[PDB]
Design a protein around this ligand. Sequence first.
Ligand SMILES: Cc1ccnc2c1NC(=O)c1cccnc1N2C1CC1
Lengths: 525, 401
Amino acid sequence: PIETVPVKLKPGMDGPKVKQWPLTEEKIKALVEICTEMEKEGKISKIGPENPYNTPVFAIKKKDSTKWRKLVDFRELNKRTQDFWEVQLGIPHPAGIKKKKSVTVLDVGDAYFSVPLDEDFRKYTAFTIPSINNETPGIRYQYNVLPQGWKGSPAIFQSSMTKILEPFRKQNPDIVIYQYMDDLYVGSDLEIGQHRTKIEELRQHLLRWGLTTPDKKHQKEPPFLWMGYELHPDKWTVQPIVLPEKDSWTVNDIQKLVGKLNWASQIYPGIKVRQLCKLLRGTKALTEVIPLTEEAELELAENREILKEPVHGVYYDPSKDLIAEIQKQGQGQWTYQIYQEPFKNLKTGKYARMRGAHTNDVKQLTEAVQKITTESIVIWGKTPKFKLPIQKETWETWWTEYWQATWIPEWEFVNTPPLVKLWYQLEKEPIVGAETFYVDAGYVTNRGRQKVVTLTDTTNQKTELQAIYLALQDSGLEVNIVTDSQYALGIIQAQPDQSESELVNQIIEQLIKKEKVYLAWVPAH
Amino acid sequence: IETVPVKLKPGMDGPKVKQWPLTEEKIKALVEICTEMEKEGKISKIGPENPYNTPVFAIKKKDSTKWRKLVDFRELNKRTQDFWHPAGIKKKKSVTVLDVGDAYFSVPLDEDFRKYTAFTIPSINNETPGIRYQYNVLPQGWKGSPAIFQSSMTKILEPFRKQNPDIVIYQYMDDLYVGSDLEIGQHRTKIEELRQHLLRWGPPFLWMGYELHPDKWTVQPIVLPEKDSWTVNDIQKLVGKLNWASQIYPGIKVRQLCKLLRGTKALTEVIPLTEEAELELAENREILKEPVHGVYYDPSKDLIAEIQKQGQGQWTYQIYQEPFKNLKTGKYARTNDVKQLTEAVQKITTESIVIWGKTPKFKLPIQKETWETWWTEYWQATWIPEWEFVNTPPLVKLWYQ
Ligand SMILES: Cc1ccnc2c1NC(=O)c1cccnc1N2C1CC1
């Protein structure tokens, strides 16, 4: 009994005109009973031959029930129907919700069928029920409400829905509602009974609009296994995950395992999959079998142990501040956890993202802070005070001297090894009394020294780094190195401390070893 | 009132742009703002049948404790039909910038366009669907607005224009640039009056409320280290710099310098310079003393703007249309990086407007996620330039300042 939403077909398009599949007399019977049931309920109505449009219908029974069910294939109509505002793909994360005293799930029965369809649009929803006898033709109808499976259906519905609640809502600032598809989660802090009572109030508010809902005795009870998590009104966790105890693992198995493991990491700290992931290298078939390594099985067992003991996330307490803490779990790995009260976790997580072929902890660390911030703003519309294993001086140093602009919010140094530091720094001016190496796969020094080495299967870019490596190698604790390679200059000036290029890493090693190193660039010819 | 029929460029459809998530503080501010804009029938809540969207942000007024609703009409402005500049302004001594945005709201928007102006007030953790509206009047930041309001504008402005033709006034989007050569004392007064002379019909000060002083804007020439003693290193840097700049000023010769560099000498070894070298530097030094000749502003081309992080809160920018063909170069010094960067951008954009009445396509030395995270935190302009993100080469940074 609510405002109907105005619809239109995509521009320059006519309604769908597609032939009805030849049905069975058996199915024709069922359909007529259903469409009649429906026409007396107003959702559909017979139409004149005026209408030339048509959409295929068919009969399928209920699942595990020996009862017929009408289905309408709206693919074509939907191909022609205008687009709508997005049925939000945005899903709330548990760590962002606040505890309630009680909560309730209200399943909306006959959702779509409780809402009207733009009258000027109904015609397009035409379909036919074939006759059993030849020159005794079959029934033409059209939809008056919202057909399941239609484009707008979910959108329009979800909309009206909110419009309806808006009222109730306003006169119940106390209560909290969240609508998801056909369910309505409703929690409050009302004492047991008062809560149960207000639900009905609501249940009625909806009733006034023909919105049928389940009674107390038929409603679902906490916890609520919501896409990945179990939701009690005051605590949460993830969907119970036990690790198989196989002795033979297939590529696919491992993939599935890693995926699962990943999921869990958002809450279960210390979950690691580096070794298991390693198992994929060179694999040739989703059904190939890979034996476990001592580090892989160790890891498996260690994760298996971690999962054994269940954990439960806490809810958002907006009155408190949210603290985010980060740790370097391994080369390239970072773990973090956010909380308002010590160890009382809202959410946890890892960060392995490597942006660029070469990086340093500082750059990497920073990138993680960013990730976190983004998340926060999204789940809580606020950013956390960070706890970081690095000292300002360190940060500031790198910062100030990096070519790209950057920014980190309020953060506090936490002395929690391993601390992130800079393993080396390029001198900012030439070193007096330090041998000067001129490179181009070979070098020459001011002291007569030289070596023109041999490199095979080496790329242009790779030949340049080599020379420099060489230079570092034969030189003493202080070196000045002159090169024409802007590339290398770049790579190194960024003072990376990890790279997935083996050569680099070596050089990096050299650098850390030296007392003072100066790198300079000069043109080619 | 009589609404002028507006339309998108042929075949183009409306914007369907994602809304960057906002902080609760911002959100609330926007709810409060739009709620009142609704009561005034400026905007209206919309329905599912509207698939369009444009991003919304809340910025803080300069030395004002209120918020301003900012709308990223970039995508739309680009798709809107084309509706159909005082060089004297850039010479003016003083120019004040005002925000005339609120005028637009007195004029209704063509009903059949309104839908394209749809935007959304996001919900934390998607706990809520998100509040959607569209505009009923001319919306701030929409290129259409100034055009469609031009007429009424000129009208309320012809008096001052002739009652004070010693003042130049330019209108760009929601902003009014009032130039003059008066004494800063006189200027500020004449500005205020204009304000009431507008109150008369339809304006807090923009850009610190403060002034601008175009007359004093100058080009940052390429420089060379002047120094007492010259070491091999110094010279190497020199030549490197020189060679680069020779692609702009071809008259630059390095010949003699390069010769002081024969031999694999030690980097710190000081090199006294020859006579030919000395003069070669001088000549080069002389060539750089001014911007390269020939470069002219082409209205039919995009105004590009690149920035470099120097350090110590110092930045370098260059405005051009064709590589090496710079229309202007400058310097910016102070906070934190972003803040600084945004202030650079805004500052730079203003100049572009004042000078070539247009906004530039920036190239920022930063990471999207980060920029998207903070820019609104310091932004105060009423317009938003187009921008892209890049990775500055260590050499270029070196070749400037
Ligand atoms: C799935 C979901 C999404 C958003 N909020 C909630 C829920 N479900 C809950 O079970 C829940 C648990 C605790 C507090 N609020 C909750 N609710 C709020 C509505 C009462």
